Design a protein around this ligand. Structure first.
Ligand code: UGA
Ligand code: UGA
Ligand SMILES: *[C@@H]1O[C@H](CO)[C@@H](O[C@@H]2O[C@H](CO)[C@@H](O)[C@H](O)[C@H]2NC(C)=O)[C@H](O)[C@H]1NC(C)=O
Ligand SMILES: *[C@@H]1O[C@H](CO)[C@@H](O[C@@H]2O[C@H](CO)[C@@H](O)[C@H](O)[C@H]2NC(C)=O)[C@H](O)[C@H]1NC(C)=O
Ligand code: NAG
Ligand code: NAG
Ligand code: AKG
Ligand code: AKG
Ligand code: FE2
Ligand code: FE2
Ligand code: FE2
Ligand code: FE2
Ligand code: MN
Ligand code: MN
Lengths: 697, 697
């Protein structure tokens, strides 16, 4: 057994990039000893073929070990390598190979492809050398690297390849290749061969082609993204029993922050979004607000909330549609405002379609101490989120092996992902020292959101995505219909969660769960809060905006004294185009309320007659006794008694019972036939509005 | 002015028949003085041409007045004559004629038709002599009748005709004819010329051909029936202000009576008829009962009631179908039983289709002191009655000028009519002394009821019909369906009044009119008496007689917990063929009850689901919670709790209210949808029956 203390891992790194730090963490996890060559100096090794500087530094380092037969040295890259197994296991596998210097093997011959015939034949394994990782005795390695006498821009790979292809040297020093990836696993050309092998508190990779458990995972060539993926788990990235291994899990001045808000398309519930900005649990005197609105549709919305935002934050800036900025130039300008302000410690980009339910998001993200991190936001009950887990070869969306697991929060942690959007927090120093260019989001025909992620990947920055907590959701903005007086009224299908929070009474849900909010003012007439004040005001407004009320000749489905049809001044939902929306409200909220209050009854909230009635002393103030063409009737007040009108009660003749004082939010549920002959009392002043549905006719 | 004391009216009469008495009443009304020739002796004047005995008696009477120029004598028939005007008016018209002996005129020449050319020409009046009525001076009349020297069977008319046709005698004695019916009105040949002229307290006839008001109405020849008609009014028969002038209007042992009951066809509600016989307000020890039943269908009905009838009356006799009697032979035998029993003072015939609502009928009729009298009975709300007012020439039904007035009781009194049926009271002495033949109803191919009336008309007996009171009604027996276990159950259409009295609860009507019989045991569940005990027992019985109850696979229109269809063991009205009948009950009795209890609601009692449920511990004892496919539900108990079954209540879950003890007559009205989730509690012993209708589905 070779003493693990005789093993030394040597690697090259000119800076402490996240990839290098990721490498060290994996090495520290297995208690490896690591010598890092070239931390101070800068990389003259080029971009293409190169890395000759690697050999020069190694040749110098080796001279102090030139006679150490007792020393085993392993050389590996650091930016694109993670370790997966112990020094003890690594040394056992090395001795098993009977080699004195074992290079990693790969599927391709590079750079000179024609040398492929000088290589020995290998039945089913990888055939060619890869200088990304080799291991051998110090004496043997010294005899190899000693022969370096070339430029820093020359090909380190070709240097080793030429030595290995020397048949006499190959067998005199007994050099070998790890054909079946027992120790070194190069990913390029082998993606379909590699899968994660999980354990309780550590994760490995398994090669299913050769049924081996490699030690060194090298994401060489165009496999940086796959290595990022594997590196979220291997070795202690994320474990079934330990969870994430580098994030917070369990949560005196906070840093100054530049908050940038982007309205790049017509967005539902923007007033609610702007209102929510005042509620983020981050001291606003430490926040600077930049808001780009591109939509003339939203100029009134922004204008209404701007005085509150200016009072709230320490500094504010609006760039409206009159400036003719594209999304790419707007996001460039916002990010560059933080870059050029040394007091900007963090940059927080937030799009209008991002709904943050966790007011602590900025804190949580800032405390995770990453260069770039984004909270995971999902469309309600669907898989689409604000991140991608994988990329198609030509940089389109692809589903990663673990995407659904992350979106469904079956695995939670902070993940290295190739694409993030809609919300993210960027270290200010990173903008200053690593991405100093202005053209982050633009300068190409590429989409701005993709150009942003590409810009950071090209610099080797990690794009982190936290689903460690519930952060929020994403609004559906696809086909938002803007041609209404109040478009958010028509949003009950696309954004039902947000639609409920805005338009359903706040105490509806607790009234549905009992708690004694529902009342029964008259026998079998139930009274419950249904619509919020905003819904009523907006619904009345949309009716008056149509403005074509009924009158003479109007026929309603009421029954009074045989055939003397009883009319109302009203507008039917069908006329204003809101029928399908109202039926959906009936299905979702009135049905279950009815089935709770009338145990035994079942309904699917069928309604042919849905309409808003107007009562005025000047036209039709009252509604004479009658029955309804309905199994039950929904009677929703839409404005305040006293403030808006006087009188106008609802009277149930057979019970000598009167709803004298209706409530603006509240609905009456009463039977429509046989027992509940009712009349609407006269409206003596003002205007009275109610919403009526003859359901289950 | 001729002194009315010088006027003497002479007539002939061998007996005091009703027609002669009718004549005298009219004469006494105008204070005429009347000499009646030949009361003691018998009529040798024949049947054909005759009446010579009339002249012989007049010739003798005249000899004492042969020289009385101061005396005016009028000779008229008596059996077929009524007087219509005063002696004073009669004498004024006689003197106006300038005649010394004025004969009545008529349209026909009789007997010798060929003499028609010897008569003078008359422009528009009647041309020929009629010996039924003449008036003249006693001296002139004496000179005419003095010449009689012929047989008692010779033609009185030809004797006068021959004298009148003597041109010398005609103008020497100045004989004349009442061409234009100023005094004498002969009806034969002039029916269309004669109408009634009404006054406040007397009635006349007017001749519309000559616009005259005749004094003497002579129903000569085949006009006896028209004279009977006119004689009901003229002169004080019936008046607009005085009413009838010979009947009672205002009502120690009563006479012994033979009561004869006839069941000659299958008759509805015969058990009720037989029961009613015990209730006639006439002391039963004075009544003898004869009952002819021709229907084997009614033998059980007769048998059930016979012990009560035998105990009730002083003597009873049944002649059943085993005797093979026709209606004519049965009615002959019954009437002949009274004829041959001198203790039978009155004969009362009553058919099974005659319903006597006035228990005092026998008394009322007996106190009217007629030879034959019948109470007026009508089919409910129709014109058909138990009498005819007129006859077609070949003796079929015809509508008299005043028929509808009588049936509608616009004129009330005791009327001389040509045809009566179904109920009548006959003086026993009339059967003995005037109709002693056995063959009253039979002996011809004529219908028995017509042969009976013909038999009395041929003897000059009057058939009287009293509508002075409400007496009763006539059952519709036309197409009585006998092929049921209880045929009277299917009689709700033909005999709705009698059907209600038998099958609707006795207190239904008073519950409909308020009075606080209706109850409301649970909220909006109304409880009222609907069906009588007999209806329930007969309805259950008809169901079990069908005997094919539902079970597995049976599907009912109930709603419970979505789609888990709730069955009952039941029979639908459609299966036993009683649907149309039950819907009629719903329309007539459940509809108005529902509209009274739910003010505002209107219904026409539509019901697709009508069925009787059976509950037993051995098959289906209960009915789980559910709603009904109905606007409201009718739940009628059909038998007694305790006596017939145990347990089995009706429970309304949302109200925590239980109908623990239903009532056999009574119905529950409750809403079928939304509010009244109900379950039928288990039946622990016996059998429980209910009747259910899902009305207005
Ligand atoms: O850039 C290169 O020199 C190599 O990039 C690729 O091979 P790959 O394994 O994907 O390259 P990296 O692993 O990403 O970089 C080589 C090593 O040089 C070090 N390095 C690189 C870049 C740098 O700025 N500073 C620095 O220290 C890192 O240890 C890095 O791992 C090509 O296959 C080689 O032709 C080329 O020699
Ligand atoms: O039976 C008749 O002797 C007459 O009947 C008919 O004429 P009509 O006026 O209809 O006869 P009636 O008026 O019904 O009878 C003639 C009178 O004789 C008297 N009479 C008749 C029948 C009788 O039984 N007893 C009796 O006194 C009555 O006063 C009776 O009015 C015929 O036209 C005559 O041919 C016939 O002379
Ligand atoms: C929802 O329910 C809450 C609690 O029942 C209501 O809260 C109260 O509002 C009234 C008047 O607005 C105050 O007098 C109470 O002091 C409040 N109580 C609490 C605990 O806040 C609330 O008003 C209801 N929502 C609506 C829209 O009516
Ligand atoms: C119809 O109503 C009458 C009066 O309300 C009921 O008469 C009574 O019957 C009960 C028991 O049968 C007796 O205790 C009372 O003394 C009766 N009162 C009178 C005034 O007769 C009668 O029972 C009802 N009809 C039915 C079928 O129930
Ligand atoms: C690493 O070394 C420390 C002692 O320095 C030891 O406590 C720890 O268990 C080692 N970990 C592994 C994974 O060998
Ligand atoms: C008939 O005579 C009596 C007197 O005897 C007289 O009182 C009555 O008014 C008279 N009636 C008529 C109708 O002339
Ligand atoms: O409460 C009212 O004003 C009458 C409403 C009503 O009953 C109806 O819309 O038919
Ligand atoms: O009262 C009962 O027995 C249940 C009757 C009922 O509800 C039904 O027939 O549907
Ligand atoms: Fe309407
Ligand atoms: Fe209504
Ligand atoms: Fe049924
Ligand atoms: Fe039911
Ligand atoms: Mn590498
Ligand atoms: Mn006559």
């Amino acid at each position: 057994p070779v003493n693990p203390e005789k093993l030394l891992v040597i690697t090259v790194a000119t800076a402490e990039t996240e990839g290098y730090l990721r490498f060290l963490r994996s090495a520290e996890f297995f208690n490896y000893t690591v010598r890092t060559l070239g931390l101070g100096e800068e990389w003259r090794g080029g971009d293409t073929v190169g890395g000759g500087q690697k050999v020069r530094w190694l040749k110098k380092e080796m001279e102090k070990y030139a006679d150490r037969e007792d020393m085993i040295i392993m050389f590996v890259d650091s930016y694109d390598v993670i370790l997966a197994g112990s020094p003890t296991e690594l040394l056992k596998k090395f001795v098993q190979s009977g080699s004195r210097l074992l290079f990693s093997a790969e599927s391709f011959c590079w750079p000179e492809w024609g040398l492929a015939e000088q290589y020995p034949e290998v039945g089913t394994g990888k055939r060619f050398l890869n200088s990304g990782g080799f291991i051998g005795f110090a004496t043997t390695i010294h005899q190899i690297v000693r022969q370096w006498k070339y430029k820093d821009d020359d090909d380190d790979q070709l240097f080793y390849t030429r030595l290995y292809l020397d048949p006499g040297l190959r067998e005199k020093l007994s050099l070998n290749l790890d054909h079946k990836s027992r120790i070194f696993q190069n990913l390029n050309g082998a993606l379909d061969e590699v899968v994660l092998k999980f354990d309780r508190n550590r994760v490995r990779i398994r090669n299913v082609a050769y049924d081996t458990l490699p030690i060194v995972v090298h994401g060489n060539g165009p496999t940086k993204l796959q290595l990022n993926y594997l590196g979220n788990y291997v070795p202690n990235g994320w474990t079934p029993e330990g969870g994430c291994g580098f994030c917070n899990q369990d949560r005196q001045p906070p840093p100054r922050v530049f908050l940038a808000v982007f309205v790049e398309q017509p967005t539902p519930f923007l007033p609610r979004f702007l209102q929510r900005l005042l509620l983020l649990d981050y001291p606003p005197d430490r926040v600077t607000l930049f808001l780009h609105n591109n939509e003339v549709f939203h100029e009134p919305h922004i204008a209404d909330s701007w005085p509150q935002l200016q009072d709230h934050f320490s500094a504010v800036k609006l760039v409206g549609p009159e400036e003719a900025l594209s999304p790419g130039e707007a996001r460039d300008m916002a990010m560059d405002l933080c870059r050029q302000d040394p007091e900007c410690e963090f940059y927080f980009s937030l799009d209008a379609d991002a709904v943050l339910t966790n007011l602590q998001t900025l804190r949580i993200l800032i405390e995770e101490n990453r260069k770039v991190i984004a909270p995971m936001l999902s469309r309600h009950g669907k898989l689409w989120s604000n991140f991608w887990g994988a990329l198609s070869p030509d940089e389109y969306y692809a589903r990663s092996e673990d995407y659904v697991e992350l979106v469904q929060r079956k695995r939670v942690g902070v993940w290295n992902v190739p694409y993030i959007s809609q919300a993210y927090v960027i270290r200010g120093d990173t903008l200053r020292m690593e991405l100093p260019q202005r053209d982050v989001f633009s300068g190409s025909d590429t989409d701005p959101d993709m150009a942003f992620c590409k810009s950071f990947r090209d610099k080797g920055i990690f794009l982190h995505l936290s689903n460690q907590h519930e952060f929020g959701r994403l609004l559906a903005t696809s086909r938002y219909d803007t041609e209404h007086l109040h478009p958010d009224l028509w949003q009950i299908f696309d954004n039902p969660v947000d639609w409920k929070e805005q338009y359903i009474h706040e105490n509806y849900s607790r009234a549905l769960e009992g708690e004694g909010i529902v009342e029964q003012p008259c026998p079998d007439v139930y009274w419950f809060p249904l619509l919020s004040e905003q819904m009523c005001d907006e619904l009345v407004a949309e009716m008056e905006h149509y403005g074509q009320w009924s009158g003479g000749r109007h026929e309603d489905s009421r029954l009074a004294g045989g055939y003397e049809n009883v009319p109302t001044v009203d507008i039917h939902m069908k006329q204003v185009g809101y029928e399908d929306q109202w039926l959906q409200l009936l299905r979702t909220y009135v049905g279950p309320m009815t089935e709770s209050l009338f145990p035994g009854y079942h309904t699917k909230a069928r309604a042919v007659m849905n309409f808003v009635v107007r009562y005025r002393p000047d036209e039709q103030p009252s509604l004479r006794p009658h029955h309804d063409s309905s199994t039950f009737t929904l009677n929703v007040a839409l404005n305040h008694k006293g403030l808006d009108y006087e009188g106008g009660g609802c009277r149930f003749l057979r019970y000598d019972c009167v709803i004298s004082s209706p409530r603006k939010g509240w609905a009456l549920l009463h039977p429509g036939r046989l027992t509940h002959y009712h009349e609407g009392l006269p409206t003596t002043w003002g205007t009275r509005y109610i919403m009526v549905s003859f359901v289950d006719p």
